[PDB]
Design a protein around this ligand. Sequence first.
Ligand SMILES: [Mg+2]
Ligand SMILES: [Zn+2]
Ligand SMILES: [Zn+2]
Ligand SMILES: [Zn+2]
Ligand SMILES: [Zn+2]
Lengths: 128, 81, 171, 123, 46, 93, 389, 486, 52
Amino acid sequence: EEDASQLIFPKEFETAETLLNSEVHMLLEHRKQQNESAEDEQELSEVFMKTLNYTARFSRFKNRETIASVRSLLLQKKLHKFELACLANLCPETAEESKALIPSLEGRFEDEELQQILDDIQTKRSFQ
Amino acid sequence: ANQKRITTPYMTKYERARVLGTRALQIAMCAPVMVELEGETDPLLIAMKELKARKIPIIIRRYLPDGSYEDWGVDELIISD
Amino acid sequence: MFYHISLEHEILLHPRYFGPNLLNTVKQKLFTEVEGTCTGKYGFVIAVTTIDNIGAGVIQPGRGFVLYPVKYKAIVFRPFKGEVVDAVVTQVNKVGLFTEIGPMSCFISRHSIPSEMEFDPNSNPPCYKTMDEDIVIQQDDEIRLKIVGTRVDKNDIFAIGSLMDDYLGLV
Amino acid sequence: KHMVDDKIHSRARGPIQILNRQPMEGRSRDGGLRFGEMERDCQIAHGAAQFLRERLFEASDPYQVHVCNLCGIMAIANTRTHTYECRGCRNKTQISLVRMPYACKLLFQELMSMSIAPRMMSV
Amino acid sequence: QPMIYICGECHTENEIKSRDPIRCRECGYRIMYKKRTKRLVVFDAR
Amino acid sequence: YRHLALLCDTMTCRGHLMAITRHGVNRQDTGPLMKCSFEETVDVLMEAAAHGESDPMKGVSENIMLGQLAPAGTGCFDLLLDAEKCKYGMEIP
Amino acid sequence: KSWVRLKRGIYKDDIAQVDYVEPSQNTISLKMIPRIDYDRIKAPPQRLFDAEKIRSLGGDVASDGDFLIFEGNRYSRKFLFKSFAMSAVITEGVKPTLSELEKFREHNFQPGDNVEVCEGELINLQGKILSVDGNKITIMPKHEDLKDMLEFPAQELRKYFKMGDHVKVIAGRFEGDTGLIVRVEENFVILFSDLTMHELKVLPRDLQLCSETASGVDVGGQHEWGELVQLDPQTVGVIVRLERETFQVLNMYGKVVTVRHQAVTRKKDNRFAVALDSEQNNIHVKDIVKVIDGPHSGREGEIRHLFRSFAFLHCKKLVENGGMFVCKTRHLVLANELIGQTVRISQGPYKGYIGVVKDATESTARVELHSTCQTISVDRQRLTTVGSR
Amino acid sequence: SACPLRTIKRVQFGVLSPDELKRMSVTEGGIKYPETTEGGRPKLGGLMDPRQGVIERTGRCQTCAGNMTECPGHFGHIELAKPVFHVGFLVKTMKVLRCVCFFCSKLLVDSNNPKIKDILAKSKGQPKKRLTHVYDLCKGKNICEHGGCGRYQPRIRRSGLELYAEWKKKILLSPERVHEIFKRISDEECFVLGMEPRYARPEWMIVTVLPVPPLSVRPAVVMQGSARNQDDLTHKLADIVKINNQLRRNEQNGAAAHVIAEDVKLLQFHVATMVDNELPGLPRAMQKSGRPLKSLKQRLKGKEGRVRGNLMGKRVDFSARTVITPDPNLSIDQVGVPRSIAANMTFAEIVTPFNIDRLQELVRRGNSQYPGAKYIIRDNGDRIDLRFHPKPSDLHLQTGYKVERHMCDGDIVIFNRQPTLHKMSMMGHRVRILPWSTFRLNLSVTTPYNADFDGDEMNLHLPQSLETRAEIQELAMVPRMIVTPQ
Amino acid sequence: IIGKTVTLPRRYTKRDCSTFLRTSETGIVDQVMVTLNQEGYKFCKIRVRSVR
RNA sequence: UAACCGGAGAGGGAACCCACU
Ligand SMILES: [Mg+2]
Ligand SMILES: [Zn+2]
Ligand SMILES: [Zn+2]
Ligand SMILES: [Zn+2]
Ligand SMILES: [Zn+2]
């Protein structure tokens, strides 16, 4: 029903706080830690483990302080929440690829400014 | 608050009938019981022993006709019977 | 996708399961049913962060079980139609490409894959490949794909991927 | 001619009519007794509300029907595949299930047949 | 297999097979009767 | 005298006389389905629908025809479970 | 070589092929489908002429090889070939369909649909349908980035739909289906239908957009999709696909067959039946089991049906037949005489009575007495079977 | 079944708009065939459709997946060749017509008036009272004041069923003209005339579409294999669609307009008969069976109608009835019942470990013996009967099951005599078993019952729910209500 | 009491039309009757005797 | 050198008259 660009959804869906791959990774590892502790406890869902594996193999930052730095540094500039989350999950190194993947980002910012933002993201990315 | 008690503390026959029936219902489908019993099989006698013991884990929400509601616990509700 | 929004769902407490720990029993019960489920409005239920509040118990007239109106903050996942997400291939087949986006399953037809991105049955692992063998999509490989159609059936969300557009394939 | 053998009968959940899901009439078909209007009013005067409700709704014709929260109209439901839809809304989210008497439901179809709109919103 | 029937006004016996006109063989009388069962009957005297 | 005076004051409580007729009870706005449950049904429902009438069914027989619990005593109030005395509840077997 | 319809007789409103036209302008020769019972019921649906059957039945019949005369000079060859009146036939406004052609343009635009302009100075313009007329619509389209309200006919417009939307087939073999498109070519549009994840190649003219998905039930309202019927009184089958006159059915042994609509009969499904999967845990309908042995080894699915040693399983990941595969249960892992007979009560409180057994149990029996206007219960040990058949 | 259950708060009453009617109709393009069905198969677009609902036993609805009980019905629409109005709406229509102008369709009431403001302020939330007040004050207006036309405006009055407008010259009220001027009635004009615009409209008072109800509303029954028994609702629907097709074809090709007007008048009479068969202005319809047709207005205004004979008083089970017999040897609170009544009457019982052995004993004793059960119901809702003697694996029991068991002494039953003249006429009693087959009771209970044993039979209801049984025991019992309040 | 088969328009045949003695009446069949109507159809009449 | 399969819901209705309370 809803497209990614025009993005019609209720106000609850708008005020829903998005999450990073790394944020989901650290939160799900935390929740798995309380699941492993406090025994005689029902185990979490296979959906929970599948999401944990997907977000662990697609996590971009391995440090919580790095995650907070990325979120603050993309936060002070005016961007949409969904486009911000999509950019943080993809981490594209080129503005052309970014605007090709996200059509709603076309015309949102300048090309050189978007490329500078992507270059900053690449520099502050935690590489293994 | 404990001051705004407009309705009477005398709980009514309707209230005692409803609480007796529902108490007998979960006694019948085997919720735990906290009044001591002398040995009975029927939830009607178990529920009336509970009602005369005045130890029910149910509080009654009375709808005052302005739109507001008031809660009355069975312990502070004085029984007409 | 991953959204941190509060949800409210009604929980029915069986009277034989009252016990001493009413709140703890209800919380353990709620963590049993609500996790791993799906709905049309909110998608997959991934995790519940906090239980916001527990409402007052209301005994249903003529029904033994008591209902507790419980609101809780949770994390849910919801893919968007007309939206691109990176994915991991589960299986490659004669019929098409099967992939997983987290818990959500997506399928790609050979009319959705590029025509050059063609399958080799002679290869021992089933994989799509090009004529120049530059792009080879294997099982458990990180690819990107444009989701073009989302549909739900019996509270299960599964999608169709599209790769006619450029910059679509293995990451 | 008034013999007790000819007069005595009793019913326990026999047949139901085609038009309405209600018991038969007359002991030849093992008929049901009419819990009539003034008897219902006198039960009201006694105050046995739960007894009257069980005598009037679920021991006679209990039903369950879906209504959406947007407009108070009937919504269709394929419950085998759990697809619930209100035409004119296409919401499928702001919906609810309520317990409904069969006779009053047929009354609602008669209302819309007479072009009455009993807009029946859940909240 | 065929039924043993009684004419009534003739007080006579006849044999009738199914899907046949219900007529006496010598007079064709439409009022027509069936004989008592061969299955045993008892009655306690109460 | 309680019931007799109650009948007469309910008769005269609307600022004027109330003969027990359709010709009065249709004029008081006391519920479209009360009016339908009176001897005239189709006209009073059809006028309520024609004028677009709202009804929260604070009556009794309206609750009855909807099949749910009528709030007219023994069902007028709500029941709430007490978790404190429930946790005081000892186990039984 | 034209087509008409008859006015009178038992053959009213039936398509007949004018083969030869007599120059006398009185009667014309028609090839027609006989609505006859071959002199069996009369002392009627359309069906092919059976010369051998009507010769076997006899009666008014004359045999001349392929040519035959029957029942008041009714002429048939190979198909009735009979002369009929010019005033009794209608030679204008017949238009036989493809089924009638096998036996012997149109414009349909609806509001809410999207159509594109492919020619003229307004080329390649997609707009929503607001109105529709007969031949020259002069539509009012809602074009993208164009608030001006243009005009286009149905010949200029083409039913173009954006990628990934719910589409419906108005008519054809794939009619009544709902799905999501895969790739739009110039004439061929391929879609996966929703109830059957199956590839349908349809035309844009046959395509239509609507918001109500597939109901999953047949045209006759008798059988749904993914259903259980009887191929034959020993082997049951599962309808896995509905078709315009047929059903694609998976059999008991995993073979996909095609049967007629009336060929199979619905069987009562035991929803409380139980089965065992050789590892001694109970399995039921709508339970997730992994298939570890057999042709479908290493798979997993939900149980749709249970037979006394067999199981019908659904998997979404298997695109074939809607994941529907059947296998034996033992390769899965979880993830009276006395009725109607004269008897005697010959021992006890009712000694000496004669009764008829209406119900018999393992231990006692019900006896309707012959003396007292009452029926009682009495034990089989005290029973005695006198007389009988 | 994924939808949560809800309790109800409010209802709104309006008219159905034709666009919404043709939207929520499952029929697309309407139905336009006077045939009921095809010769061999059910027909789509005829009088009966599978899209309308489930047709036969062990069949499926075309729209929903339900069957008979689970199929709740689906609706349809029929576009009319000419718009038509009916009674009730006709009377309110002519009231609105006398309120409104004829030519310019202006308000004509001059709402910028202190009288109008006072009427609104008094009837804040009284739409019918506001309508009566504005009609009374606007009856004496004649010419327009605003209204551009200076004509006197015609007096519109009914002649039987049709309406004529006569100028100070008489003409027929065309339904198209009435629909047009009701459409030209503005929204603010509608609100100041005092009727809610969002839920109803003056141009919704006139209708151009017929909503058709499902086969639940019009059942199809088979008798001796004939299956030709169809109801007068179906017959009148066939007449309506046949006349509508005739009008549509005639306006398509002929348009001689005289046959059009005359057949439109007959179609208007037909839909008026659909509203009510009995009309003071026109004779009722006629069937070949010799009986008058039954309309829905009659079907609800009758004493056997839905509102009274099916809503206020409806048929109920769990209710025996037989003649009584004096008996002084039992107490005033007890009633004795026959063994056959006690065997054919059931009572629901929860399986608890306190009495599980006795319930198991009663179960394998079973039906057709007096202490026994006839139905066993599991936790999931599986209903298993005992009269066909299932396997002992089925006869095995666990805690929490539902037992339809024969009652014994001590159970509470309600017991009455029609008419219930006084509220003392229905008392609760404890059931007991005596050999001979009649009701046994006390003279101290006959005295309030107005009972005197000359062939008067009583009714005996037994509640199934335990809380209903408890509340009957504790409210309607004879010692608890020895003394009357009146 | 009376068994009749009505032919209707695999391995299934004409439907059952079996008229019963009414529920909760006992006793003995005393005499029976077979004749023809004015139409020519067969017509049966069975009397039920019940001592009280 | 082969092995324990089981099956029960109902079909009109509408009018008139009589009788009983
Ligand atoms: Mg008397
Ligand atoms: Zn809606
Ligand atoms: Zn003779
Ligand atoms: Zn349906
Ligand atoms: Zn004017």
